[PDB]
Paper text:
In comparison, canonical α-carboxysomes utilize β-type CAs, namely CsoSCA. In this study, we determined the homohexameric structure of CsoSCA from H. neapolitanus and investigated how it is recruited into α-carboxysome shells composed of CsoS1A and CsoS4A shell proteins, as well as CsoSCA encapsulation in the context of Rubisco.
We generated constructs that express either the NTD or CTD of CsoSCA, as well as a CTD deletion of CsoSCA; all three constructs contain a His6 tag fused at the C-terminus of CsoSCA for immunoblot detection. To investigate the molecular basis for these interactions, we evaluated the CsoSCA–shell association by performing single-particle cryo-EM on purified minishell/CsoSCAΔC and minishell/CsoSCA-C. Initial analysis of micrographs from a preliminary dataset revealed the presence of T = 3 and T = 4 shells in both samples, which is consistent with the shell population observed from expression of empty minishells. Notably, we observed a marked increase in the internal density in T = 4 shells compared to T = 3 at lowered contour levels. Therefore, we specifically purified T = 4 minishells by collecting elution fractions from ion exchange chromatography and screening for fractions enriched with larger minishells by negative-staining TEM. Despite these efforts, we were unable to resolve ordered internal densities in our cryo-EM maps. In contrast to the previously reported CsoS2-containing minishells, we found no evidence of structured peptide interactions between CsoSCA and the internal shell surface. This observation suggests that CsoSCA interacts with the α-carboxysome shell in a nonspecific and dynamic manner. Closer inspection showed that the disordered internal density in both maps contacts the CsoS1A hexamer but not the CsoS4A pentamer. This supports our earlier findings and suggests that CsoSCA is likely localized to the α-carboxysome shell facet rather than the shell vertices. The minishell/CsoSCA-C map has less internal density than the minishell/CsoSCAΔC map, consistent with the smaller molecular mass of CsoSCA-C relative to CsoSCAΔC. In addition, the internal density in both maps appear to contact CsoS1A hexamers in proximity to their central pore regions, although this remains to be further validated in future studies.
Residue numbers in the entry:
A (entry chain 4), E (entry chain 4), L (entry chain 4): 1 to 81
B (entry chain E), D (entry chain C), F (entry chain E), G (entry chain C), J (entry chain C), K (entry chain C), ...: 6 to 97
C (entry chain D), H (entry chain D), I (entry chain D): 4 to 97
């Protein structure tokens, strides 16, 4: 898992129906680092430090074994800087 | 954006969860939380049509299983000018 | 008491809500910020604090009020509240 | 005394009967009558622990058969200081 | 698998319930390297050199086929510097 | 942190394993290992509420299947000042 | 107050939970925690009669389901002067 | 309070023993001379006094503690104690 | 003998514990650091050493003491002990 | 204290046993013993509410099995001033 | 002799009987009597291997039927030097 | 798959029991490159150039569908420099 | 390291495979290959205890399915000084 900071929300209206209703967030390891998009399974605000899991675990973390995700937020770190 | 999204719940806890989920899901503005009466609570957001669509879907998903649950989740992409007179502009 | 997490408990009637508020405040280091009469008999009590404290408080309050009067409706925790929702969250109980 | 007694009823007539019963049964102070909504009415008393116990017992017994009846009867021996902010001080 | 050094513990109170009771540790390949979070399936102290497995093997190493992990500590290296 | 976590086991080996698991799981301080009598052993930790919660959960999971097993795993987020007089401050 | 409250549990974790519950429930003083032997643990409180009644009720309810559970919960309203010699004054 | 008779009550746990001691001292003119933690959960309380007083006290204590906690184990009276046993009998409760 | 790994064996009674300690110390290069009377019949013996040595020692001790007296209760190994637990671990047998 | 405890028995021996039990159990004042007629005997105590509750409980338990037994055990937390004229002040 | 004999019994009377039996049966030194806890008692002897074998056999036979009986009887011909630190040297 | 050179052996005594009896080797793409640990399914000496497979294929290559490995040596290259 | 590991096989091919697997698995030294007689072949390694444990486990796994298979796989962590006189120091 990686420690990442939530930057902003992301909306894709024509995304595939397999994505369900889950929201999407733009995350990076630090400001200026390469951007990635994660499925928000917790509900996070910009500036939050979050735990993100990839590989096949992200699919089940996002809701189902066949969910189309390779990066899912699974928790907010209590204290981090 | 001038689109409108609203979610109605039974009780205040699912309504708060729905509003939180919507505002976290997209760039929408929470313009009202109305105590309808008899336990109904409605939260309303404004924004661009796609943002409101995403926010309402996420909020309905989040609040479906909280407390006494969800009543309605609706999106109005183009609001007639007459309805703006009954839509609140800021929460209280 | 610091922290920006939110804990909410909804009951049917005021007596279970008061019991839940007492249980939460006794169980953890949280601030009681509001009691709201929703309508139709629903009453909601809200607390603020750190995430762990709010978690413990909500658990204790739900357990305490589940058997009082007409019972418990909802018990929920939000670790980080969006700034938009703070406009509809009460700041002091009054 | 700082103990808290609480009786919730369906309607106002059982609530008034319960308040009369508690205040006659023990030396307690009636500090509030709240219209909760949906027909719930709550009456609150303060006093010493034993007085409040006796008062709540008497009030529940008196109001259990009046009108639509009794919903809850609860005693809190020692109230946390935070909860004092949501309790009325005088019965306005 | 990667050789990594345990730095410190990590707590996420609002993490998803699928994570169970397993503890989490912050690991890196060396001091100053990018940080990662691993599920501690062994029980390790800060400064320990540990073996970490990713991909789908981390899920089963953490306890079950559906566990939400992409990095799990599976052993402490007996002698390493 | 002033929260309290405790784990009770049958025997000393599961208690040692539980204490090790808790202290490895979170930033908590082991303040006592008590030989209760009749085979019971209790280990107590102090720290911030979330840290103690994580530590106690991990310790219970670790010590459940060791020796004669686990008896209790409890967390007290806010300890009354009276109980501090019976809580140990450092192990022996 | 000179009433005496007493809760006996199997193990130390339910005893600590009971002590916390009583001291939070009423204005009572925790005067002792005794390791009886064989796993029994007893916690004793002193205070006014009604406060002790409320505290013992709360402690029994809280500790009945923790660990190996509750053994006894007893209240003595007025203690004979001879029995004071076997009761601890402070929780060492 | 005089008398050299001995009254003993054994219980499982400390709460029934304390209840028995209170009952004995309230029932008769006896002195509480000791509470002993035997081991394995046994607790013994001992009183001294005249034979009739000790008899009444032991009866009352057994009746009172038989239903408290894990219950009563033994209740016995010795009218005259051999001087050898006084070496193992406690003199003050402490 | 160096190493900071910990090996523990719990038995019912002292004879199996002594047999286990002898077996461990004969089987591997470990130091016997303590024998503890837990209460209720439990006895625990603790050894320190390198991870492999402690593993071998604990295996041998469990095998040896499993059939002696009232038998074996627990056999556990901790490769690295947190510094907090060292405060409750004995340093010398005595 | 101004609470009132009352125990009625069939015969004088259970009444005396009940009076002894209440006065030993709590700090209450025995204010009267009345020969009602037909074999009824009533004993009355005054004191604080909790003390009177404990005393009446103990007296009922003690006298329930003595002689012809117990008839009634009642507690009035606060006595109306008119009723004071029919209650004895001292046990003549 | 450096062999070690060990007999564990339930209670002290069988342990004393076993110690007497071993010390009478062979030329062994009684080096300790340990109260293990929970009722277990262990008696330890040292001597030459054959003497210790005879002594342990005799002690087990003698104590097997006394009181609550025998738990274990074990002989270690050569004790590792590390184990000597947990064995008593004199029967205090 | 990657071409890597075997550096040395690695021993973790307290590794999880799911690892079975398989040995572990330290491998790198070249001397001085970042180190990785692979399950040796062939039997290789230091200095050997080997073929290493990751992802979920490493699990089955190491012996079973649930084996905890994300890097397994599956062959020795006949001629490589 | 002074630990000892040995593997016994039926035939020389599984023994060679076992020795190769052990020496490839860990930092151990092959000190002997003994033709026991009747087809038994034994290979012995020395090293640190953990290294020998890993090597023996890997060698047993590798040679189990080769030729007539494996007979024994054993680890002695601490070798008595007497056995060193029958242990070979270098292969032939």
């Amino acid at each position: 898992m990686k420690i990442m900071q939530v930057e902003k929300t992301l909306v894709s209206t024509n995304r595939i129906a397999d994505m369900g209703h889950k929201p999407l967030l733009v995350v990076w390891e630090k400001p200026g680092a390469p951007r990635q998009v994660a499925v928000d399974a917790i509900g996070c605000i910009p500036g939050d430090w979050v735990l993100c899991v990839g590989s096949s675990a992200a699919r089940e973390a996002a809701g189902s074994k066949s969910y189309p995700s390779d990066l899912t937020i699974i928790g907010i770190i209590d204290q981090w800087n | 954006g001038i689109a409108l999204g609203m979610i109605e719940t039974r009780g205040l806890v699912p309504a708060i969860e729905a509003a939180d989920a919507m505002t976290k899901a997209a760039e929408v503005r929470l313009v009202g939380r109305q105590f309808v009466g008899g336990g109904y609570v409605t939260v309303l957001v404004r924004g661009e049509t796609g943002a409101v669509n995403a926010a309402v879907r996420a909020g309905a998903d989040a609040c479906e299983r909280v407390g006494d649950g969800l009543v309605a989740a609706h999106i109005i992409a183009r609001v007639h000018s007459e309805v703006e007179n009954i839509l609140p502009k800021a929460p209280q």
